Structures are given as C-alpha cells and as structure tokens.
Amino acid sequence: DLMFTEMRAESWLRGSGSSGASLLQILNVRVVGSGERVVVLSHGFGTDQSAWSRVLPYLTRDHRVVLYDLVCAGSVNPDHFDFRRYDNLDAYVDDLLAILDALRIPRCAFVGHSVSAMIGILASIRRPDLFAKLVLIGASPRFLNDSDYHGGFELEEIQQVFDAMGANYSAWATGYAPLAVGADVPAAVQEFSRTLFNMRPDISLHVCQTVFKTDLRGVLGMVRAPCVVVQTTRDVSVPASVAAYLKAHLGGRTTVEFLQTEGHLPHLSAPSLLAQVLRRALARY
Amino acid sequence: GASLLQILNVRVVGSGERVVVLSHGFGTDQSAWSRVLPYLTRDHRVVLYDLVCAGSVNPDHFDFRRYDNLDAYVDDLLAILDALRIPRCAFVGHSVSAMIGILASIRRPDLFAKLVLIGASPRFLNDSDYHGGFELEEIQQVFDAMGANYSAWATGYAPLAVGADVPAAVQEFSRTLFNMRPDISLHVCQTVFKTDLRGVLGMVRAPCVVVQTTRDVSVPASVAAYLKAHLGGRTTVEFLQTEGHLPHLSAPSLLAQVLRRALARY
C-alpha cells in the first residue's frame, strides 16, 4: 500500500538528524539475520559487540539481531564520549532508545550483559511497550555492599582499583582480564584483554565509576517485562545472593538460569553453553 | 536484488572517503577481522561480509553447482559493491579471498584501487616448475579425514593452520570451522585446490601489497616471491616476523599496523 510507504517516509524525516540516526554510525550499529522477532545484543564493560560473535550464528537464522557498541567502547570514536552527558546510566539508556527508534523497531527482546543489564532494566521501565522480554547476564542492581546488602565490593576496594587503573592502565588490564574471565579459558582472557586495552583509560575510569555508583534496587519492581536472569557459578563481580535478590525483586515474570560454568563473561568463555541458553530464552515472546 | 546484503551478513563500519573491503578465507567469517577493524574504522569506511560458505550464512543458499569455481564468489563480491553503490575501494583478502579479489580487479579494473593479499597463493598444488606446498595424494587424505569425522578433524587442523602458539587464535578458528557444514567445507576446500591463477596474474593492473608470514603451512616463502614477480601491477612484499597462515587471528597487534600503512593512501 502507498500509505505505508509515506508513513515510513515521514518518520525518516521526523527524526532525521537526532541523536539516534547519527548514532547508527557512531555506535557501529549492525543488523543481522532474518525473523520478525527482534533481538538486541548489548555488551558490557571492557568489551564491544565482537563479544557476541560466538553466539551470534546461533540466533541469526530465525531472529533479526541488532548489535551496537556502548559509547565507552574502544571501537567507538572517543571524542564522542561526553563526560558530562554520560554521568549516569540514564544517558546510555537514551542511546539505546534512540538507536531502536531510528531503526523503527516497536518491539524487541533485549539481551544485556552486566552494566547493559542495568541499562536494559531502566529502558524497560522507561518504555514498557518496547521490550517484550529481558535476558540479563552477569547482572546486579548494585555492586557496592550495603547495610543489609552484599554487593561484593567495598568502597575502599574500588578506590584501590581506580588507583591501579590510573597508575598504569595496560598493566592493570592484563592483570584484570583473567580474574574477570574467572575460568581457565585462555581465549576468553585474551579477547577480553584486547578490547580492554582498546579503551582510553579515562573513559574506563569514568564508566567504572558510573557503574559502581549505580543502585537500581529501588526500581526493580517497576519492570513489567518478563526476565530471564542468567547467573554463572562463581561470578567474581556478582555474588549468588545478588542474582537471588535481583530475581525476587523484578516485578515482571522472572526465571533464573544458573549456568554450570564459572566466570563473569560466559558469552566469551562459555559460548557453547550460552548459545543454547539464549535460543531457549528467545524462542517465544 | 541486494537481499544479498542480508544473505551474506554485509556490514559497513567507520567513516571516511576511502572505502576498504575486508574479505575472509576458508573456515572463518568476518569475525576474523574484529581485532584489527578498530584500527581502520576511524579514517576508513569498511565493508565486511561472509563468503557464501561461512558457517554464519544460511547453508540453503549454498548452490554446489553455481559455486563450482571462484567466478561465482567474485559475482557475489561485485554485486555487494554494486548494491552499496561503491565505485572504488581497496580490497583486503585472506587466502581464497586473495584469489577472489585478483579475479575481481581483472574483471572490474576501475573498482579496486589497491589490493592487499594475506596468506596468498595463485596455486596450492605443487607442479613441475612450481613449488606450491601441496600434493594430490595428501589432499585426498585430508578429504577422507574431513568426511570421516569432521569435528575431530577440525580440532586437529586448527592449531596447525594457526601455526603459532596463540591458543586464542586456535579457539576462534576452530569455532568457525565447526560452524561449517562438512559437505560445504569439502566442496570449498576442493574448489581452492583445483584453482590456478598463475595464468592471469600478469593481467592485474592494481598496485598490490603482498603480506607474507614466516612459516605458513599453506604458503611457501617462494610463493610470495612468485606472486611478487608475476602480478602485473606495482607490487611490494611485506614480511611479517610472525609465524602462521592467519595473522589477523594470531598477530593482530602486528597486522593492524601493516594494514594501516597499506591502506593510508590510494
């Protein structure tokens, strides 16, 4: 129908320019696959969208899959990192929403690793009508310990991290990569290292400060979207009591998938498992 | 139609007036370029795609009769460029993709301003006066191994093609080797060993950079010299200190700088 043509015609204009459209190139957005079922893959700290490469083939035959880099990723032009604007997660949220709008996507499923899990939680709250479902990996509503809440991190602790990062970043990253991967998977470690080196140390520091800062405990109940909470065995940055908290307290229908593998980056270190986990979590919505 | 763009997972990344095309080789897909891509995308527009035979393309699109030789792969390459309205670019080709781009620029001389060939050979079989690196009997044995039990073969093959001890490269390759349907791997493997471009090398006009690694199972040092001597365009050879047939997987800290220098002006 012609009317269909002209309706898409104006929304390309209504919105040409924006944040969104220009973003497509800035954030290296990629659409792959076929399906009327849309899936967004959102990576976390220290990586870029290449982190999803191993599991990507298992999704593209019957999903259209959207990937983008977080603005803090080393694969993004670092002049684009506005230190004021990206003070807290809300601004990363706006980017996601602007990407999806520019692509003209009214309903999708969202997969988020780590801080991207936070981003997705907030986006779902901002736009309950856009996310049919959430899949959350290595996710935490709050990293800092609190009076009754074990986050896994003390303030004095993160401050030590900060210092090490600022003192020699490349050395810090080399040491960090294995601890974050956790498992003895030398290929995940060398991949995580590489994207970690790509980031500019000041942006890494800004982003980490922004993550450790965040606390979503208060708004978990506002989520209306079904969630799959994916938790690995000995996640260094996510205790099991947290995964446990996150699940009880999300207000949409929530299921937990407890992976047998250890480490915080299963999409890198356990793709043989996570791919199948992901097919199942994304089969209907 | 450029439903081809979708079928082959085509991707465009970066910014710049200079276009670059990255084309991968046997047993991988465009993810093989991920480590060096961020070194190109600031001042290049980069086009990546998957060969019709990659494990990340729907295997139903693989027509055994059509893709009987390399001309069809070339067709796909050119169609991608036409669908994107790219009139000129630099091409970066690994292994079989090195052969492809050679055929391509012969076919459309105006389209490719420069070629960069990695792990490149015009012919893998040995011959009377020609040391290519392989013999027919030995090839037949690989086919048997691949047909007998494909995964177990892939696992043994990965580390030897990677060459060097870089387990991370071993694991990526092995992984994308696993993704290929066995019958498609054989057919493409087959096509590559029956290919001989020695006769058309002199027809290339584009300037070329030949990237040779130190102990490449598939590519004797002398093959690179041969390429150099017979390519019909202005040609230079870059010798990598590193070992192995897949430097974008196993030496990306080195290869990226090589590529930056190879693609800085054209």
Ligand SMILES: CC1=C[C@H](O)OC1=O
């Ligand atoms: C999970 C996490 C720890 C690291 O320091 O930065 C992070 O985002």
